[PDB]
Amino acid sequence: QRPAPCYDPCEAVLVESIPEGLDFPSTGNPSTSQAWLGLLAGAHSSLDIASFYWTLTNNDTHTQEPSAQQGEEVLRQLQTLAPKGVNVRIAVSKPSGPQPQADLQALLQSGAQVRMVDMQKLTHGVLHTKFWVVDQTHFYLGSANMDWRSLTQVKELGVVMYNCSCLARDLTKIFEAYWFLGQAGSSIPSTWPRFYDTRYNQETPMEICLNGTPALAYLASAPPPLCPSGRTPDLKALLNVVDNARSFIYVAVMNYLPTLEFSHPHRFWPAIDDGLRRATYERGVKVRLLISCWGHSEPSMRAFLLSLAALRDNHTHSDIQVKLFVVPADEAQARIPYARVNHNKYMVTERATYIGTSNWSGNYFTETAGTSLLVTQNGRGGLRSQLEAIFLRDWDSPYSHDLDTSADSVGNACRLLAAQ
Amino acid sequence: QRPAPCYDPCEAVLVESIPEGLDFPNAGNPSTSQAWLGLLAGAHSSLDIASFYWTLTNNDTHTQEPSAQQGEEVLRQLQTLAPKGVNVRIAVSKPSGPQPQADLQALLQSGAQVRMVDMQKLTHGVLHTKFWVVDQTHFYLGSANMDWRSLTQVKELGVVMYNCSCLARDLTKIFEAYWFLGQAGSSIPSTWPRFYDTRYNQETPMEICLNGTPALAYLASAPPPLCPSGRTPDLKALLNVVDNARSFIYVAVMNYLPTLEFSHPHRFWPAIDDGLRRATYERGVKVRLLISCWGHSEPSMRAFLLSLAALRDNHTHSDIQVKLFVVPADEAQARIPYARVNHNKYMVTERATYIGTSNWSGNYFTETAGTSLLVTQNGRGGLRSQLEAIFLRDWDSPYSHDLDTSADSVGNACRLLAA
Ligand SMILES: *[C@@H]1O[C@H](CO)[C@@H](O[C@@H]2O[C@H](CO)[C@@H](O[C@H]3O[C@H](CO[C@H]4O[C@H](CO[C@H]5O[C@H](CO)[C@@H](O)[C@H](O)[C@@H]5O)[C@@H](O)[C@H](O)[C@@H]4O)[C@@H](O)[C@H](O[C@H]4O[C@H](CO)[C@@H](O)[C@H](O)[C@@H]4O)[C@@H]3O)[C@H](O)[C@H]2NC(C)=O)[C@H](O)[C@H]1NC(C)=O
Ligand SMILES: *[C@@H]1O[C@H](CO)[C@@H](O[C@@H]2O[C@H](CO)[C@@H](O[C@H]3O[C@H](CO[C@H]4O[C@H](CO[C@H]5O[C@H](CO)[C@@H](O)[C@H](O)[C@@H]5O)[C@@H](O)[C@H](O)[C@@H]4O)[C@@H](O)[C@H](O[C@H]4O[C@H](CO)[C@@H](O)[C@H](O)[C@@H]4O)[C@@H]3O)[C@H](O)[C@H]2NC(C)=O)[C@H](O)[C@H]1NC(C)=O
Ligand SMILES: *[C@@H]1O[C@H](CO)[C@@H](O[C@@H]2O[C@H](CO)[C@@H](O)[C@H](O)[C@H]2NC(C)=O)[C@H](O)[C@H]1NC(C)=O
Ligand SMILES: *[C@@H]1O[C@H](CO)[C@@H](O[C@@H]2O[C@H](CO)[C@@H](O)[C@H](O)[C@H]2NC(C)=O)[C@H](O)[C@H]1NC(C)=O
Ligand SMILES: [Mg+2]
Ligand SMILES: [Mg+2]
Ligand SMILES: [Mn+2]
Ligand SMILES: [Mn+2]
């Protein structure tokens, strides 16, 4: 019945990017930059990267920002891997139109292998997933793109799992589907071959030793056409955490919208929304939704968030709260394209950890590629409590604002607030 | 494979009860009282009544109100039918606990047949339906209970369909299920016998001649265990109207709650709520929900109504609006038990009419008995526009209030306002 357990000494580390000038007067996590540099320096045999886009340099973004140095160093170290014998495979989303690929050209010339995946053709989605698998042993999974802005100008949340080969090998099965689909002539197979299958899923998670105590872990993926036998869909894994919570659900995600954003005519998509309403009304669960806001936020988000916030009622014990996280910007930072936003995508409850790559609207679960890590672990003081502390740090910070906040007071453009 | 059309000269009349003191300047339907007295006077062979409870007299309600006299006259006329040869059959919900039944005892003594239906035992619900079928030819369907207060002290909305035997016989099939289950030793049959089945439903409605022009009509019923082959469930019919609307949905219902109420564990029930959200967001449908409010209103409705009201956004063209209809009550009116509230339960769109007996929460569609009339009819005017005109009269009146209105300022106690 149950699959084999894992004997590897798995260790998980939450890693963040904190934008320049964002201050939290309190503990510290290793930075995305530091963690990535360490992974690269120790890579000896293989590196697989699932990626959305590559802008690791100032030239890529047509900027002259000092704070692009960290991404430029990442690209410099990446270029050293293939010449020293590491097998580098990079899957990247096919861009919407003509676009130079200076980073990937440089990596190809160093000996890395690169394939573009045309998710638009295959599923009408895009390859939005961000992860690394290093020597079939460690992996990074999280919000940070292959982007210098993802290190110093955008807030990111991810995890690095070290020394955990069983789960690294499991994640590689998700990578291999991108790798297969990046080849000329590819199409979605009606049945994925058995070597894509996994035994480790919602019904039977992987038993691992995580920081020296037992834990249950599995990896979910999207979209459904890429799901082989045994692989839990991302949406199912997410809703299972929501449905199982009995005390609180804390969600930090850049975008939340109960719609199929890009499909015509536009379509209502209440899967997650009704899950949250069911949790608070049926089980008294305290729901806190921390949504990001910047100049590029879809303004239709505001009415849907107000609709959830209205479900606060002392007598039913319904208790959903919404705040908007806004990264401030000064004049120089405002000139950097697509920067100064909180990019995290995660959920934590009193009993479970969910760390994802996708924003929370319907296309990310039906058409677009993504991956999430799901962990449960008995006891206190582990990965789950560390992620809860990050959430509460952000939730309580001066960068989080109620929906009635004056837009002219938050330090960056925010479309989801009124002038009132 | 379409079923036979009806050849009867069907004629529909909307009938209301307007509580004493409720004024609408310059807005003219026969009252429930008048319509019921007309049906009783003309009845020559049969009267079937589905009913929730009977309090047609002052003594029933322990009051001394002159406005009870219309209900008392209805009871006096009901007592004349069986002695004159009319077969009277009355189905009534079994009360929660012991209660006197003065009205039904008087009707039994006159020769009427009365059966009490234990819906609590059968389905964990109650027999909430209100309708009359007269001479297998006419019927009343609507919100009014067999209650003197339903004539003069509560606002009611119903319809009388005259001269329409095909549809009246169709409604009797729903009555016959109540009538069977009100017999000692009854149980829900695993399959209902064929004589309960109907051919007229959402997929193939009855073709009738309604006020001289073609129309499509059918009758939906609740709960599912009482549905024989062919009978559309109330919830399916309701959601079909919501899902087919392309311009507006106007709903006037006493209670709206997206829950399976008084269930513990509490159960969320978004069937209708999500249909309205889908309509406004996907199709740009303008939704107006007119919910009643009084001192007995369940206070948890407020958060769910505010949650719908938040979905108004210029650029998505989402446009849901909520108001509360409050019937004023002075200190004398407030001494009357369970009065001074708007009882209507109906929905109208730019293309369809829905008139029901149930409030809009989950138990009414899963466990409790109810019935609704569904009509579509090509053309301007008609029943549909008459019901729309009633809705807008109420919506625009000084008795309808936005959810940010002070609770001091609506003329009666209202639990859904913050003050
Ligand atoms: C499961 O197991 C794993 C593996 O063991 C555990 O992960 C470990 O967690 C440790 C936390 O106890 C963590 O410890 C470090 O965390 C922080 C990261 O330090 C890094 O950055 C520092 C600062 O870098 C800035 O400054 C330098 C110079 O000042 C600049 O060059 C640079 O550009 C930056 O601007 C460096 O100084 C470090 O050398 C390191 O590179 C640090 O904050 C920690 O140090 C201090 O932390 C406390 C409180 O924050 C201070 O009060 C105290 O003085 C410490 O000096 C510390 O170095 C481990 O790094 C991490 N391991 C790995 C491999 O990442 C999981 O926690 C565990 N989970 C459980 C138990 O649930
Ligand atoms: C499909 O066909 C059906 C069948 O014909 C149509 O139904 C008919 O609709 C008619 C509407 O034009 C309607 O006509 C009358 O409607 C009103 C109701 O009249 C009744 O009540 C009056 C009220 O008087 C009482 O008022 C107080 C209230 O506090 C009482 O306490 C007290 O007892 C008073 O007596 C009575 O006076 C009437 O005798 C009657 O019982 C009336 O207001 C209408 O009268 C006005 O209009 C006429 C001419 O239009 C004027 O001459 C008059 O002076 C008034 O201004 C009117 O008589 C029919 O009653 C109704 N038929 C049935 C059987 O119900 C549907 O409308 C049709 N649908 C469509 C879409 O076409
Ligand atoms: C992953 O496993 C390696 C072993 O392969 C760990 O490295 C050892 O760490 C201990 C404690 O710091 C040292 O005593 C050993 O000398 C190290 N050996 C080697 C070969 O490096 C490493 O610390 C583990 N990583 C994490 C994050 O737990
Ligand atoms: C229901 O059917 C009866 C029977 O035809 C209709 O009553 C007739 O109406 C005409 C037209 O006004 C009168 O001239 C006749 O005298 C009536 N006959 C009888 C026996 O009453 C009646 O109008 C129909 N519609 C309604 C709403 O009752
Ligand atoms: Mg999915
Ligand atoms: Mg039903
Ligand atoms: Mn769980
Ligand atoms: Mn319709």
Author numbering:
A (entry chain A): 72 to 96, 99 to 493
B (entry chain B): 72 to 98, 101 to 492
Q: What text appears in the publication on this structure?
A:
PLD3 is synthesized as a type II transmembrane protein and proteolytically cleaved in lysosomes, yielding a soluble active form. The deficiency of PLD3 leads to the slowed degradation of nucleic acids in lysosomes and chronic activation of nucleic acid-specific intracellular toll-like receptors. While crystal structures for RNaseT2 and DNase II are available and provide important insight into the molecular details and function of both enzymes, no experimentally determined structural information is available for the 5′ exonucleases PLD3 or PLD4. Both PLD3 and PLD4 belong to the phospholipase-D (PLD) family of phosphodiesterases, a protein family that shares a common biochemical mechanism and an H(X)K(X4)D (HKD) signature motif within their active site.
To obtain structural information, crystals of hPLD3 in the presence of the identified ss T*TCATG oligomer were grown and diffracted to 1.8 Å. The 5′ end of the first thymidine and the phosphorothioate group of the second thymidine were bound in the active site. The phosphorothioate was coordinated by six hydrogen bonds within the HKD/HKE motif involving the active site residues His201, Lys203, Asn218, His416, Lys418, and Asn432. The O5 of the deoxyribose was bound by the Tyr411 together with an alternative conformation of His416 (in protomer B) and water-mediated by Asp220 (protomer A). It has recently been reported that iodine preferentially attacks sulfur in phosphorothioate DNA and induces nucleolytic cleavage. Therefore, the bound 3′-phosphorothioate thymidine in the active site is most likely the cleavage product of T*TCATG, which further underlines the 5′-exonuclease function of hPLD3.
